[PDB]
Amino acid sequence: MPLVYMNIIMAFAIALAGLLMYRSHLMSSLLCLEGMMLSLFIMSTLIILNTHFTLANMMPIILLVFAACEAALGLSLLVMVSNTYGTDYVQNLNLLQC
Amino acid sequence: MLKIIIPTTMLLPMTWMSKHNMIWINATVHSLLISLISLSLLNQLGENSLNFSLTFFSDSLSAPLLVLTTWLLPLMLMASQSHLSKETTTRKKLYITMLILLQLFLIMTFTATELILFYILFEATLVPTLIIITRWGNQTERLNAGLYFLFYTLAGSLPLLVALVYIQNTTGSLNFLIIHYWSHPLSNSWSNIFMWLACIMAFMVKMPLYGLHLWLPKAHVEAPIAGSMVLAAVLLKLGGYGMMRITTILNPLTNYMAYPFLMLSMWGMIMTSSICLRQTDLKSLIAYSSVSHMALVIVAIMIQTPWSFMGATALMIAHGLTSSMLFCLANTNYERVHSRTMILARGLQTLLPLMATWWLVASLTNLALPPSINLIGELFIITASFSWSNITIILMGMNMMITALYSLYMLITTQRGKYTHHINNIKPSFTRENALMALHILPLLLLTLNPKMILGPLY
Amino acid sequence: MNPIIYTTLIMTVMSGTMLVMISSHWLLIWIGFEMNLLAMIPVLMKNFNPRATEAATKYFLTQATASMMLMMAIIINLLYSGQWTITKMFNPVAMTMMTMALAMKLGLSPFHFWVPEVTQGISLQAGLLLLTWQKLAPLSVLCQISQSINPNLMLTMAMLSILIGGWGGLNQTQLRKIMAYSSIAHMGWMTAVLPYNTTMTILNLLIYITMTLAMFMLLIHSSATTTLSLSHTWNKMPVITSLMMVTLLSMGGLPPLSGFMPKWMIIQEMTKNESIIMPTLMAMTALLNLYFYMRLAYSSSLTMFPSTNNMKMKWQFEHTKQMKLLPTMIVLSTLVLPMTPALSSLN
Amino acid sequence: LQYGPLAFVLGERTTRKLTETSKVITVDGNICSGKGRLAREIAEKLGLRHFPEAGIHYADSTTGDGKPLDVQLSGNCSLEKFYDDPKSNDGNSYRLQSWLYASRLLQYADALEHLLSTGQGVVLERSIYSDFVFLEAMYRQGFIRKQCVEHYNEVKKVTACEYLPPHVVVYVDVPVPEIQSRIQKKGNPHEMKITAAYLQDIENAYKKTFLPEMSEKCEVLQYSAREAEDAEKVVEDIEYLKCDKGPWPDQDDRTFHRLRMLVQNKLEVLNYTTIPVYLPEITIGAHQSDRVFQKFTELPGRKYSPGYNEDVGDKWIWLK
Amino acid sequence: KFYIREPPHGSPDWLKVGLTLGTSVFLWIYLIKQHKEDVLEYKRRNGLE
Amino acid sequence: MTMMSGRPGRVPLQFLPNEARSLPPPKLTDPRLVYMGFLGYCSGLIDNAIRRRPVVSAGLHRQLLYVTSFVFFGYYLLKRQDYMYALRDHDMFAYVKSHPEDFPEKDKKTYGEILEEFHPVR
Amino acid sequence: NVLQIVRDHWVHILVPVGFVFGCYLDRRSDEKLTAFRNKSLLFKRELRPNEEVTWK
Amino acid sequence: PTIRLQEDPDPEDENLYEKNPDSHGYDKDPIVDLWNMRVVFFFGFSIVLVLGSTFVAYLPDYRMQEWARREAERLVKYREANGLPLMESNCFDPNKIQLPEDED
Amino acid sequence: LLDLIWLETILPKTTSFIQMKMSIMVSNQKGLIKLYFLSFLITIMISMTLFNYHE
Ligand SMILES: CCCCCCCCCCCCCCCCCC(=O)OC[C@H](COP(=O)([O-])OCC(O)COP(=O)([O-])OC[C@@H](COC(=O)CCCCCCCCCCCCCCCCC)OC(=O)CCCCCCCCCCCCCCCCC)OC(=O)CCCCCCCCCCCCCCCCC
Ligand SMILES: CCCCCCCCCCCCCCCCC[C@@H](O)O[C@H](CO[C@H](O)CCCCCCCCCCCCCCC)COP(=O)(O)OCC[N+](C)(C)C
Ligand SMILES: CCCCCCCCCCCCCCCCC[C@@H](O)O[C@H](CO[C@H](O)CCCCCCCCCCCCCCC)COP(=O)(O)OCC[N+](C)(C)C
Ligand SMILES: CCCCCCCC/C=C\CCCCCCCC(=O)O[C@H](COC(=O)CCCCCCC/C=C/CCCCCCCC)COP(=O)(O)OCCN
Ligand SMILES: Nc1ncnc2c1ncn2[C@@H]1O[C@H](COP(=O)(O)OP(=O)(O)O)[C@@H](O)[C@H]1O
């Protein structure tokens, strides 16, 4: 692989680690989710363009579509959470235990 | 042998279709008829077994056990109907259903030709017993007892299943005939040692072996009367039957492997007999006596000689009958005085003479008075052990003393002395209880009249 | 929520599962997972309260992370071989990513923490749906890619699932959490035999689904979500508690009940290869699940707990809504062992 | 067909049946006041279904046959022994209060189900929103403990939140001495032992908690004793109310569907009455529970489902 | 004797009863015919008769 | 591990290929079919019990439908299971026939020529 | 008058009928294991002029 | 209430001899109890016990003991008359046994 | 000493003690997503290192 491929995979790893490590806000973790989606889009586009897979050129667009759904879903949940507590802090999602 | 299996499955809907005041009569009559039918299995051959089909076979080792089970069912029916009088009709039918299912499972267990079917039935016997103990027991510890009865068994039997399937991947069959005919020696390796332990420890925990016996006092004390009868009479003999079956594939690894179990059994018979000398509960004494006798049977199976096998068979049948009779005897007094303390009710020979005669006969048969089959089995086992090593006569001898002591001790504590003054509700014995005692005791002496019927296949 | 909207959402969840199950393209499988999650989120929030919202949020976060890892694995596999078909997974790193993502989706240990919380936060119907229908798609993909699996990783996760399920369920008084921990342990059992025989996985999944459906339908029939709530049922419907006890016996794995059939067969299969130690450990660990099933049976059926006065009024009314498939489910979850060889029809 | 999601999907919608006279009405007042006569008159003039006050045996009249059952199998409480010995050590007072609250909840569910199924109005004497005053009168007199009040509050909190308050609350005000004189003239030997402190506590509970807090949900029609006999005047006052302030106008068709599914299936209504909180006044041991349940199942029309008891003349059972 | 309608009346729901009985008889007839055809087809393929 | 999914000539969702018509059908008195009917009867009884009806007498048409449905499903289930086992045996025998080197039939020795170690019990 | 007697005591034929059915099933099972009938080296025998099988 | 719940008092045990001085201890219904006693005594002692013992006592000799005795008498007679040893240490003919070629 | 104490201490009581302790350890989680998502990160790294690097 070239340096670009490892750079994109490194960005994906950074975004995954950022989501997995929460600080306080749910919006920051949602942003990390969108970052992972963006890195996946870039990597898939590079792989498809490099190998000249013509019919696969539409797959990244489809990816983006479902990405939007995820984003919307998250935002919806965020609203409800805030309406319960006045803050989007993940410390308040502790009514259920193991 | 469906001619015995189908009538029990017909006992089921007969019980569930009976009138509210006729369940006991129908169940008792048809259980007795089934026992009479099963009596035909005693006509055994001298060379091979009665191979009924691809699934079921009757050997000289299993026929007396089947007869004992089918005979025990009416006795449990008679014993249970006293303390279940206030129970509703549906729950009485459920109790009878549990007893019938247990008998069906035992009947199918004692005749399965394959080892895996034997395992499935010998494990299916757990559910009705646990339900009976934990639902119709009297005190609060019964729940705990149920747990001790369950996991103690399963922790021993889960490895066996693994071993079983492993064997079928190596030899290609679990049929007992093919297993016997195509037997091969076991080498001395760690894999074979652990295969031996997996094949043996389930039956060891079922007997139970000393140190693995803690479930038995709890389960046999907390269970109702019918539960105690079936636990002491038949369910303990599953371990012995399974061990006698499975030892055919463990040679010659058995000589090296048996030592710890032999020492455990001998020192444990001594220890349990000694424990019986200081027991304030009447049911716990009988439970520990059962442990001692089963330790003797373990030694007999483990030394692996023909005389030892005959002794094991005779002792198993004799102990089943004797322990059931003793548990019923104790339950009569418990139903009178609603307590299990042995020194609470004394001098009962003054108030209940025929009941004291039954107590005397049961205690005499417990200590193996000749020429009862108890003594026949005990003496055959002792002779085999003496051939195995002349020093065993020490430990066995000590047992023969201590046993007698506690047996007579029990009698002397309950029947002799002076009656307790403030206990003024000792009603005269009923016909049901006397008939239960007589139906327990007469087959024992009748069997003494013809002992080759309970001496097993090695005869 | 409108009944039409609820029906549409349930159909969308089912359609996502079937899209995963009928596809030959990795993109279509990922799309099926996406659609299933999107339609599943509102089903968890059908009855609105803060606990349901928290459960839905946790479920969404977990499933989104798992789906992103799934997409990454697919992209890496495409990079090292321009293949989109669901097949032997030509790259090992992509296969590790796939195994971890599917384990997170299934709730396998150590990605198990979300299952008890989500199950406790939602209603009994949503819990039924989550613990029965939501297992099909990841297990189907795992069955399809079984040849290239790394046995060490899945066997580790399966053993951890069994251990953690038993230990966690040992401590629960809430019925939904007990069901969640049982689900984790059964997931471990199904994934332990996957590298050796997928037919055993399918059989175990079917038996577990039947048992779970019967259990959840009995819990819906008597409106109990706690042990103490279920301890009142004998004073209202004793037949329900009796059937509950036999169902718990079957789920415990005791012969001759049907719950014995999968484990038995799985053990046998693992002894057709060498694999002796793992089945022994798995059975010894399943004894814990048996223990807490037995404790529940003690609380609900084998003893009678004290009741309340107002229960008398409940004696005068009957159950309006009746589940038509409950008797068949109970019978299949208890009396099916003699039909064991019929499993040959599965392959 | 039974009402459910299918009936709502096609056709059936509740909001079309409401014809400006839905109007759940409750008429409150102290003991021995003539609220029952006023309720009957209001129902007769407005053409609404009248519901007599829910007593100990209200549930028996709605199931099986309408005949009441034995107090041991139904209620397990006595009002007469509450009057005789309000401080009994067997917890009769709170047991009676709890059973009465459960009966009122069942009656409210029945009235709501009738209104939503037919569109016809209903008139009630007391409601779950009015019961608490009696409880307060029990607590201030030392008749019940504080834990009883806490359990009552828990059950009320989990139950009364799932229904709608009445449209119009009618109150009849009678002075305590007049109540005592009416009780004296009535002649029932048990009500003679009601002290003036009990009635005073009921009156303070009403006038300080019930009316002030029910005035926020909807307007309250208060009538003195003298202006309660003219039922036509009260009815014509009711016909000229502007009801646009409560939760009722803000109810669309889906919430009506949910409420209609809740009011039927009375087991769902009564679910939280028997929460596993173990107060000695209402907790029953396993042996007595078993005995009483077995006794209940032996009643002539109770062992099986309503249509499957052949001992009360049910035919063709083997084809149902 | 019921205070309510008790929608299940003294007579059964004849439509549902007839549908159930008809389904049972149709299933039994189909099974018998299928078994007959299977036996004939097997005998033809293996050439017994 | 999937053994039979990739077997050549397999129709995806057939459940009963034409080749299975070459096997004898299960008898209508097959004990497995009788057990399936028993399962249907048990389902009917439990259905009566749950709904608080006379268990043995409530609905004869419902119980008949239960038994019939269970028998009807069991017949085809047994057909497919027998077909699968026949396929397994056929494939096994063909593979053994086509690979003689892997399955050699070596010389048979009488027990008068094999030395077996004797382990005395004493 | 026997209607009541039968409706009370009809449960007393289930067990004998089960026993007879079990005997019949045992005979049917015996019928399927005749592959070595009159063929063992120990009991091989020339048939009598009239009999067809040595055992059923 | 100083109590924990509402319970029935523990009932006293009923004595069967109070209503039926000749009770047999089987049931509270005198006729049902008498017939229970009758069936137990008839089918336990009269049918199973005595007839079963008679059946077992006369069980035909399938263990083949008399046959073995007669065969032993025949063999002993022949061997004693012909001068052969009564029993041989080998139960299998050595002509049919092939020992290994080399023992070194 | 033997039956009521030590035979009880070794087999059943030790097993019960160990199972109860492990149950308390496993099920004592506060329900905060932060902690076990950190655990997820640790698990992913360990699985990438131990199993994925050895193929
Ligand atoms: C292996 C060989 C073959 C055996 C197969 C396995 C066993 C059989 C299959 C199992 C399923 C069959 C029955 C299922 C429905 C049962 C539901 C029920 O409640 O029954 C009550 C019902 C009585 O109710 P009712 O008449 O409406 O009036 C009384 C009230 O209902 C009053 O009722 P209630 O509700 O007021 O009473 C409350 C009571 C009610 O609670 C119960 O009744 C418990 C019933 C639970 C059913 C079992 C669960 C599901 C099946 C699994 C079985 C496991 C087997 C494996 C071994 C493990 C053992 C657990 O609950 C309690 O009191 C709690 C007590 C705690 C005890 C815990 C033990 C329960 C588990 C026992 C299961 C044993 C197997 C089933 C035995 C049959 C039971 C009737 O029983 C019956 O009348 C039906 C049973 C007999 C029908 C078949 C007879 C056919 C016609 C006769 C002629 C025979 C033809 C022969 C052919 C040749 C021509 C001559
Ligand atoms: C606890 C009891 C469990 C029972 C489970 C539910 C039973 C009822 C469900 C009815 C099943 C409907 C199927 C019949 C419609 C025809 C569909 C048919 O074409 O399916 C074929 C296959 O038929 C089905 O698989 C057979 C289902 C039979 C299930 C019963 C077996 C249970 C094991 C033994 C338990 C006892 C059963 C008792 C029955 C009441 C497709 O074959 P194929 O596409 O190539 O395989 C896909 C999977 N592969 C490729 C990975 C292999
Ligand atoms: C109350 C007062 C009591 C005192 C008064 C009593 C009066 C006298 C009565 C006592 C009789 C004395 C007995 C003396 C022995 C005579 C009987 C003996 O000779 O018969 C034996 C025969 O006895 C029977 O074989 C033993 C009885 C069988 C026992 C089976 C028990 C019945 C089943 C019940 C269920 C069992 C459950 C336990 C399962 C194992 C001989 O055996 P055998 O050498 O061959 O016979 C050779 C000739 N044959 C072979 C042609 C017949
Ligand atoms: C209440 C008390 C009950 C508890 C008693 C349970 C203990 C039972 C004894 C252990 C059984 C484990 C063996 C399982 C079946 C073995 C079958 C077998 O033959 O497998 C061997 C392999 O043997 C094993 O793998 C066994 C290893 C043991 C793993 C599990 C350990 C369990 C605990 C061991 C110590 C317990 C000692 C007995 C209990 C003492 C009482 C407390 C051969 O396999 P191959 O790999 O093909 O070898 C040939 C080619 N190399
Ligand atoms: N929740 C309650 N608690 C205690 N007593 C009640 C309760 N509800 C009604 N009662 C009793 O019902 C009796 C008469 O009821 P009331 O409605 O005031 O008279 P009327 O039937 O003429 O309308 C009174 O003695 C009153 O105490």
For residues D273 and D255, what is the distance between their CA atoms, to the nearest angstrom? 23
Check if the beta carbon of residue B105 is closer than 8 Å to that of residue B120.
no
Which residues in B lie closer than 8 A to residue G15 (C-beta atoms)?
7, 10-11, 14, 30, 33-34
Residue D168's SS3 state is strand
- Helices then strands (H, E): number in chain D? 14, 6
Q: Within an 8 Å CB–CB cutoff, is residue I32 touching chain C?
A: no
A64: in domain: yes
Write the single-letter amino acid at F29. T
Amino acid (one-letter) located at G22: G
What is the interface size between B and I, counted as CB pairs within 8 Å?
12
Dihedral angle at the C-alpha atoms of B333, B337, B340, B343, nearest 10 degrees? -90
What sign for the dihedral angle of Cα C22, C24, C30, C35?
negative
- Contact between C58 and A96 using a beta-carbon 8 Å cutoff: yes
Q: G21 vs B10, B318, C304, CA distance in Å?
A: 11, 34, 42
For residue A83, being part of any structural domain is answered with: yes
In chain I, the residue whose alpha carbon lies closest to the alpha carbon of C94 is I52
Q: Minimal CA–CA distance to F51: which of C318, D271, D4?
A: C318
How would you write chain C as a 3-class SS string?
CCHHHHHHHHHHHHHHHHHHHHCCEHHHHHHHHHHHHHHHHHHHCCCCCHHHHHHHHHHHHHHHHHHHHHHHHHHHHHHHCCCCECCCCCCHHHHHHHHHHHHHHHCCCCCCCHHHHHHHHCCHHHHHHHHHHHHHHHHHHHHHCHHHCCHHHHHHHHHHHHHHHHHHHCCCCEHHHHHHHHHHHHHHHHHHCCCCCHHHHHHHHHHHHHHHHHHHHHHHHCCCCEHHHHCCHHHCCHHHHHHHHHHHHHHHCCCCCCCHHHHHHHHHHHHHCCCCHHHHHHHHHHHHHHHHHHHHHHHHHHCCCCEECCHHHHCCCCCCCCCCCHHHHHHHHHCCHHHHHHHHHHC
Query: Chain E closest CA to F33's CA: distance in Å?
Result: 12
**Contact C225/C124 with Cβ under 8 angstroms?**
yes
- How far F57 CA sits from the closest chain C CA (Å)? 17
- Contacts of residue B24, Cβ cutoff 8 Å, sequence gap at least 6: B77, B81, H26, H27, H36
Q: What's the CA-to-centroid distance between D250 and ligand 3, angstroms?
A: 93
Going through chain D in order, the beta strands assigned E by DSSP cover 25-29, 49-51, 122-124, 168-173, 220-224, 283-284
Question: Rounded distance, CA B247 to CA B245, Å?
Answer: 6
How far away, in angstroms, is C274 Cα from ligand 4 center? 13
Closest listed ligand to the CA of D54: 5
We report the CATH number of the domain holding residue A20 as: 1.10.287.3510
Crossing angle, helix B373-388 and helix B392-414, to 10 degrees? 150
Q: How far apart are CA B346 and CA C175, in angstroms?
A: 51
Domain that includes residue G23, residue range: 1-56
Contacting subunits of C (3+ beta carbon pairs below 8 A): A, B, D, F, I
> Residue I4, exposed/middle/buried by CB under 10 A (0-12, 13-18, 19+)?
exposed
Structure tokens at C289: 């699940």
- Reading the block at residue F61, the tokens are 């048409």
Please compute Rg for chain H using Cα positions.
Answer: 36
Query: How many Å apart are CA E35 and CA B78, to the nearest integer?
Result: 50
* CA quadruple C50, C53, C54, C56: dihedral, nearest 10: 160
Quote the CA–CA distance of F11 and F15 in Å, as a whole number.
9
Q: Which residues pair with D50 in a beta bridge?
A: D123
Cβ–Cβ gap D318/F59 under 8 Å: yes
Report the nearest-CA residue for atom 29 of ligand 2.
C346
How many structural domains does chain G have? 1
> What is the rounded CA–CA span in Å between residue D238 and residue B419?
85
Residue numbers in F near H97 (CB within 8 A): 112
Is residue A76 one of the residues assigned to a domain? yes
Encoding tokens for residue B172?
A: 């290609």
Give chain A's domain count.
Answer: 1
Interface touch B5/G22, C-beta < 8 Å: yes
Q: Which ligand is nearest to the CA of B449?
A: 3
Burial class of residue B288, CB neighbours in 10 A (0-12, 13-18, 19+): buried
Location of structure tokens 């009865």 = B149
Listed in sequence order, the residues at least 6 apart from I26 whose beta carbon sits closer than 8 Å to its beta carbon are A98, C164, C167, C168, C171
In a domain, A21, yes or no: yes
Phi/psi of residue H29, nearest 5 degrees:
-85, 115
Cα–Cα nearest to B301, from B232, B199, B394, B403: B199
Spatial CB neighbours of D279, under 8 Å, sequence gap ≥ 6:
D91, D94, D147, D148, D151
DSSP state of B428: P
Domain that holds residue A88: 3-92
3-class DSSP state for residue B305? coil
CA–CA distance, D37 with D17 (Å, rounded to integer): 28
Q: In chain D, which residues have their Cβ closer than 8 Å to the Cβ of F58? A: 308, 317-318, 320
Which numbered atom of ligand 2 lies nearest the CA of F4?
A: 52
Distance from C-alpha of C198 to C-alpha of C6, rounded to nearest angstrom:
34
Contact of A60 with A44, CB cutoff 8 Å: yes
Distance CA B335, CA B16 (A): 28
Is D119 touching ligand 5 by the criterion CB < 6 Å?
Answer: no
Q: Is F21 close to E41, i.e. CB distance below 8 A? A: yes
Q: Which two tokens stand for residue I35?
A: 């902690």
Asked whether D73 and D295 are in contact (CB, 8 A), the reply is yes
Residue B252 in contact with partner chain F when CB distance is under 8 A:
yes
Is residue B124 within 8 Å of residue B131, measured between CB atoms? no
- Burial (Cβ within 10 Å: 0-12, 13-18, ≥19) of residue D251: middle
Spatial distance between the Cα atoms of D94 and H30, rounded to a whole number of angstroms: 47
Cα(B380)–Cα(D312) distance, integer angstroms = 69
Q: What are the tokens at B1? A: 């042998």
- CA torsion F94-F97-F98-F102 (nearest 10°) is 120
Q: Which ligand is nearest to the CA of C279?
A: 4
Task: Give the position, in ligand 4's atom list, of the atom nearest the Cα of C284.
Answer: 6
Task: Report residue D114 as tokens.
Answer: 């009738």
Rounded Cα distance, C322 and D2, in Å: 12
Strand partners, C307: D284
Ligand 2 within 6 A of CB of C336: yes
Tell which residues of chain A come right before a gap with C–N over 2.5 A.
none
Look at residue A98 and tell me if it is in a domain.
Answer: no
Chain I adjacent subunits, 3+ CB pairs under 8 A? A, B, C
**Buried/exposed code over C90-100 (b: 16+ C-beta within 10 A; e: otherwise):** ebbbbbbbbbb
Of A37, A56, A96, the CB nearest to C120: A96
Asked if D28 and D35 touch (Cβ cutoff 8 Å), the reply is yes
* Cα end-to-end distance, chain F, whole Å: 50
Chain G residues within an 8 Å CB radius of B30: 15
Helix (H) or strand (E) holding D35: helix D35-46
Q: Which two tokens stand for residue F16?
A: 């009963």
Backbone angles phi, psi at B350, to 5 degrees: -65, -40
B185·F119 Cβ contact <8 A? yes
**Nearest CA-CA partner of B307 in B398, B378, B233:** B378
Atom 38 of ligand 1, residue of closest alpha carbon: C238
Amino acid in position H95: N
Which helix (H) or strand (E) segment holds residue B353: the answer is helix B353-366
Å from CA of B195 to ligand 4 middle: 6
Selected residues 4-33 of chain H with any CB under 8 Å from a CB in chain D: 4-8
For B439, the 3-state DSSP assignment is: helix
The answer to whether residue F7 neighbours chain C at the CB level (below 8 Å) is no
The tokens of H10 are what?
Answer: 């523990």
Question: What is the distance in angstroms between the Cα of D62 and the nearest Cα belonging to chain E?
Answer: 7
Residue D218 burial by Cβ neighbours in a 10 Å radius (0-12, 13-18, 19+): buried
In a domain, A49, yes or no: yes
